[PDB]
Homo-oligomer: A and B are copies of this chain.
């Protein structure tokens, strides 16, 4: 069986860039396709009536069907969700692992938001007003990655995922046969 990961970060901290690089070196890991209001089905399932017909939050929603089958197949799964979703998932599925990604400074956040070139010259300040409040939830997460130097932060992220696959539970499923041979007198 696989691990459920929650990855959260303020916009522009580097969560998208770190996860994409993590996936390139981690074939057993998938990323959940959120529904939100780019390619439909790849980045997101791109309305409210279908959503009301059945975690979810306004800041967006995570499809429940994909998660259940994926974990039972042994795949690890990353949810790129906000603190509201993280709280919902942690309540419904307490075994979920949570990782928070933070910038080295508030100004680096603004520079990255501005340098990404996807938001407006005022939405950067609109998102920054909520950025300090959003980052305050870092205390609710199992691990913290400070995305200063990208390469080091990628290593930090890979170490979390590798250490997790080395846990007792994961090693028992993946290396069951080796463990059996080791104890076979």
A interface with B by C-beta (< 8 Å): 14, 17, 21, 24-28, 73-75, 102-106, 108, 111, 114-115, 132, 135-136, 138-139, 141-146, 149-152, 154-156, 158-160, 162-164, 166-168, 171-172, 174-175, 177-179, 181-185
The DSSP consensus for interface residues of chain A is: helix
Contacts of A146 on B, CB cut-off 8 Å? 171, 175, 178
Query: How far apart sit A154 and B24, CA to CA, in the bound complex (Å)?
Result: 12
Question: Quick one: given A156-B162, A163-B160, are A182 and B115 in contact (CB under 8 Å)?
Answer: no
Given contacts A106-B181, A178-B178, 10 further A-B contacts (CB under 8 A): A25-B150, A27-B150, A73-B114, A74-B115, A102-B178, A102-B179, A132-B184, A145-B166, A159-B163, A160-B163
A35 shortest CB reach to chain B, Å? 19
> Copy number in this complex?
6
Tell whether, in the assembled complex, residue B136 and residue A183 are in contact, meaning their CB atoms are under 8 Å apart. Answer: yes
A76 shortest CB reach to chain B, Å? 10
Contact of A168 among B144, B162, B164 (CB under 8 A): B144
Contacts of A24 on B, CB cut-off 8 Å? 21
Closest partner residue, chain B, to A24 (CB atom): B21
Contact of A183 among B14, B135, B142 (CB under 8 A): B135
